[PDB]
Amino acid sequence: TASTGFAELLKDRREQVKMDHAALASLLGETPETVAAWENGEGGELTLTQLGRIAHVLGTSIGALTPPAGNDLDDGVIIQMPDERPILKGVRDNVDYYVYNCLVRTKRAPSLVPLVVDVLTDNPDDAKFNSGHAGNEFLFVLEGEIHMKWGDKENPKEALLPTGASMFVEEHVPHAFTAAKGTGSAKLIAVNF
Amino acid sequence: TASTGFAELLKDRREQVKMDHAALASLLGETPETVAAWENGEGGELTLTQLGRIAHVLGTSIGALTPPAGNDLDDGVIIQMPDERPILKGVRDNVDYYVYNCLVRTKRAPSLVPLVVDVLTDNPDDAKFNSGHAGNEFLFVLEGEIHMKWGDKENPKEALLPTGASMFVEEHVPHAFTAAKGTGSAKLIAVNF
Amino acid sequence: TASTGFAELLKDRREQVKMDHAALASLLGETPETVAAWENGEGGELTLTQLGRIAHVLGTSIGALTPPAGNDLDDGVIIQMPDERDYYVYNCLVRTKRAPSLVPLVVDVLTDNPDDAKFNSGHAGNEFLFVLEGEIHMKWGDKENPKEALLPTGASMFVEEHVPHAFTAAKGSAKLIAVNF
Amino acid sequence: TASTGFAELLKDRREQVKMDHAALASLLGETPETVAAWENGEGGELTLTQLGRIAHVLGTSIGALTPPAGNDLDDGVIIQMPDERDYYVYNCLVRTKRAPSLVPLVVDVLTDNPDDAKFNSGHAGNEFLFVLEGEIHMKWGDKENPKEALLPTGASMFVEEHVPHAFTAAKGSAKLIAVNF
Numbered sequence: 208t209a210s211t212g213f214a215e216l217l218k219d220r221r222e223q224v225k226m227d228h229a230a231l232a233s234l235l236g237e238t239p240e241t242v243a244a245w246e247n248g249e250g251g252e253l254t255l256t257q258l259g260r261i262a263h264v265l266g267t268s269i270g271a272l273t274p275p276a277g278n279d280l281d282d283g284v285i286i287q288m289p290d291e292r293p294i295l296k297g298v299r300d301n302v303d304y305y306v307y308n309c310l311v312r313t314k315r316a317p318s319l320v321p322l323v324v325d326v327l328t329d330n331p332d333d334a335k336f337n338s339g340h341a342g343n344e345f346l347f348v349l350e351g352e353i354h355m356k357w358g359d360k361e362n363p364k365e366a367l368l369p370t371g372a373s374m375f376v377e378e379h380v381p382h383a384f385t386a387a388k389g390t391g392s393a394k395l396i397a398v399n400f
Numbered sequence: 401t402a403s404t405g406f407a408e409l410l411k412d413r414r415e416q417v418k419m420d421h422a423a424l425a426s427l428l429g430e431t432p433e434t435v436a437a438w439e440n441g442e443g444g445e446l447t448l449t450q451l452g453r454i455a456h457v458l459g460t461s462i463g464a465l466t467p468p469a470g471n472d473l474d475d476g477v478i479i480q481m482p483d484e485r486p487i488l489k490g491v492r493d494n495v496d497y498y499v500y501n502c503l504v505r506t507k508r509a510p511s512l513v514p515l516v517v518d519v520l521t522d523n524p525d526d527a528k529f530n531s532g533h534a535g536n537e538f539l540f541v542l543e544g545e546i547h548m549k550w551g552d553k554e555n556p557k558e559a560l561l562p563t564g565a566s567m568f569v570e571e572h573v574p575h576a577f578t579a580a581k582g583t584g585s586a587k588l589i590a591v592n593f
Numbered sequence: 594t595a596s597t598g599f600a601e602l603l604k605d606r607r608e609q610v611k612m613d614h615a616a617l618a619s620l621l622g623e624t625p626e627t628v629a630a631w632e633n634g635e636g637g638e639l640t641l642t643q644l645g646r647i648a649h650v651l652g653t654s655i656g657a658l659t660p661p662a663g664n665d666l667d668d669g670v671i672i673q674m675p676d677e678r679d680y681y682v683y684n685c686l687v688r689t690k691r692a693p694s695l696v697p698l699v700v701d702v703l704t705d706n707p708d709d710a711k712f713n714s715g716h717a718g719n720e721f722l723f724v725l726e727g728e729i730h731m732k733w734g735d736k737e738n739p740k741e742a743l744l745p746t747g748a749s750m751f752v753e754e755h756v757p758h759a760f761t762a763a764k765g766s767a768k769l770i771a772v773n774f
Numbered sequence: 775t776a777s778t779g780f781a782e783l784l785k786d787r788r789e790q791v792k793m794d795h796a797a798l799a800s801l802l803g804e805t806p807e808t809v810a811a812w813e814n815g816e817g818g819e820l821t822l823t824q825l826g827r828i829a830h831v832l833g834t835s836i837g838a839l840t841p842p843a844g845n846d847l848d849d850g851v852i853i854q855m856p857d858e859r860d861y862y863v864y865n866c867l868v869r870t871k872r873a874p875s876l877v878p879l880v881v882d883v884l885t886d887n888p889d890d891a892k893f894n895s896g897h898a899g900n901e902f903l904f905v906l907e908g909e910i911h912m913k914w915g916d917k918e919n920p921k922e923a924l925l926p927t928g929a930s931m932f933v934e935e936h937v938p939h940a941f942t943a944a945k946g947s948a949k950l951i952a953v954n955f
């Protein structure tokens with residue numbers, strides 16, 4: 208359907224710029240038949256580079272010519288059981304820092320990246336910061352006690368947060384977490400959106 | 401600042417429609433001085449109804465004339481301790497159904513409404529549905545085992561979800577929750593966004 | 594109505610943040626009956642300041658509690674006859690609440706001395722232009738060191754949002770159609 | 775470049791979903807080195823189908839992994855001279871990648887028999903119009919039972935997105951400026 212989506216979106220864009228197969232084909236160094244094939248779903252082999260030229264000549268982006276992420280929901284819902292959970296190691300400028308246990312996601316809300324994060328180190332003094340990431344993030348301390356740092360890593364804002372505490376971090380705001388000094392480990396829920 | 405915001409936004413809108421104090425004032429049955437006062441932050445007493453007429457004559461909405469929600473963050477962050485948590489009773493077409501324990505919120509992301517929801521009843525047979533609400537919702541089973549129902553309440557999709565399970569519910573999708581038959585009670589995290 | 598839209602949006606928002614009439618009332622120096630009344634369309638007299646207070650305690654903006662501009666279209670269309678509409682003379686063309694940012698005009702440039710051009714501070718929204726008659730001397734960017742261009746009849750241009758600009762006829766009047774969107 | 779924008783967006787997305795090169799490679803029948811190469815700008819040869827597969831396993835769309843149209847503006851502006859541009863004759867006016875939806879035209883309506891009007895199926899985007907010359911007979915809505923209007927020179931109109939329409943000169947040619955945005 209990437210090719211099918213491109214077929215329909217290609218036709219539409221060309222129509223809105225008032226071009227006919229021949230008009231577009233010449234600007235691209237192709238034959239009007241080749242263009243017809245694309246609008247016929249035969250554009251599956253076009254390369255990223257060709258898509259760029261096509262987008263350029265059409266005065267728009269590749270995104271505008273490709274379909275949305277799609278629907279992976281069962282009647283508007285999708286669930287994830289506990290064992291289906293994927294795991295990824297979080298080595299911050301290398302030392303084991305977090306453990307990312309991924310929760311359910313969906314192509315209907317791409318920016319939603321929920322996670323159960325195991326905070327490994329318990330020494331605030333060696334907290335490893337972020338640069339800040341695109342997107343807001345809601346957090347909840349699931350277990351243990353967390354020691355959070357944010358803002359300027361050279362002189363950051365801080366907070367001791369026990370179980371049940373919730374937080375909100377605005378996009379691009381640098382942040383770092385560790386368990387409270389000496390408590391060994393902690394766990395929080397992180398929902399990026 | 402609602403009045404200050406309106407002052408600046410009023411000036412801007414009037415400018416974009418090419419009107420001068422007198423032009424606008426006449427269309428409104430006011431004096432150009434009165435308009436000047438509004439653009440001077442003296443519009444604090446205007447009623448909702450007057451704001452509507454003003455918006456109408458300006459060919460736009462009241463929202464376009466009022467400032468954004470505002471910033472309540474401390475360097476891009478806001479936290480909420482466990483005891484600061486507000487509680488609200490959830491009586492579904494009246495019988496105690498849920499208990500809403502509100503988590504942190506922010507005017508920088510108004511649609512974010514996180515919550516620890518106590519699912520009170522444990523009899524799926526008398527699950528009380530929603531009509532579906534505006535907005536997506538991410539869920540996580542915090543404790544116990546949940547019995548979820550969604551879609552057509554007359555013949556719904558269902559799922560037994562143990563601790564750790566996570567779910568996603570698309571906007572307007574009707575849904576209902578109860579603890580698993582006989583398990584007494586359950587608890588989940590609900591993040592509306 | 595501003596009062597009916599506010600009534601439904603206020604109710605959606607309250608419910609959205611799990612607040613009952615009582616809870617909300619406690620935050621605004623009002624009784625739950627008053628709150629319920631607003632949700633019944635009786636909030637029409639609320640002041641801007643009060644609305645600001647209401648949006649605040651609900652953690653949102655006034656705009657989120659007020660209805661959109663509205664619909665002034667006839668089955669999707671709205672028309673304006675030519676009769677129903679010192680640097681410039683703005684002859685305002687058709688407008689609509691279904692697209693507030695659309696502000697089309699036929700502008701008369703009465704001046705023709707480029708060095709006497711007066712820049713605007715730049716404005717929100719993009720702007721398409723078309724030289725309808727005469728020649729135009731366009732200036733944009735920084736007024737102290739601006740880019741310039743001579744535009745003849747038939748010429749079309751686009752100036753991006755917030756980019757300051759100025760117009761005059763070419764040295765020694767001009768008419769153009771400008772469309773903000 | 776499409777390959778450089780894809781390189782950074784692909785990397786942001788992978789990191790955003792907590793995936794390392796190895797994890798992503800395992801999902802696309804590629805080695806982690808190949809993945810790292812794409813993030814080094816070497817994905818230029820990837821096919822549309824492959825891109826579709828990449829967006830899929832990353833739970834998003836191709837558009838989210840590809841750069842925006844780009845910037846063809848001169849300090850915020852772009853100009854078009856009058857020379858650089860059977861129902862209609864479209865004389866395309868200035869366009870720009872900073873606002874793809876903007877498609878201004880000077881349209882020549884060569885026909886003048888309203889009952890021979892041919893509706894379009896409606897198109898995305900709003901459209902402002904201005905009768906530049908002659909008289910126009912406008913039709914819109916359902917082609918089987920459409921609304922109609924006689925528009926004289928100077929008249930301006932707005933047709934909302936997806937509303938089907940048709941134009942011809944008044945019974946017994948016309949020229950107008952149309953702006954899609």
Ligand SMILES: C[C@H](O)CP(=O)(O)O
Pocket residue numbers: 324337340344382384397
């Ligand atoms: C909790 C943290 O926000 C996890 P990160 O976004 O830094 O990977």
Ligand SMILES: C[C@H](O)CP(=O)(O)O
Pocket residue numbers: 517530533537575577590
């Ligand atoms: C968990 C449920 O989603 C709580 P509701 O949105 O129905 O109030």
Ligand SMILES: C[C@H](O)CP(=O)(O)O
Pocket residue numbers: 681711712713716758759
């Ligand atoms: C007049 C101002 O100086 C510029 P405009 O409002 O035409 O964009």
Ligand SMILES: C[C@H](O)CP(=O)(O)O
Pocket residue numbers: 862892893894897939940
């Ligand atoms: C020509 C088509 O029939 C209508 P347009 O593309 O001018 O909107």
Ligand SMILES: [Co+2]
Pocket residue numbers: 337340344382
């Ligand atoms: Co983070």
Ligand SMILES: [Co+2]
Pocket residue numbers: 530533537575
């Ligand atoms: Co819900």
Ligand SMILES: [Co+2]
Pocket residue numbers: 716720758
């Ligand atoms: Co302007």
Ligand SMILES: [Co+2]
Pocket residue numbers: 897901939
């Ligand atoms: Co059209």
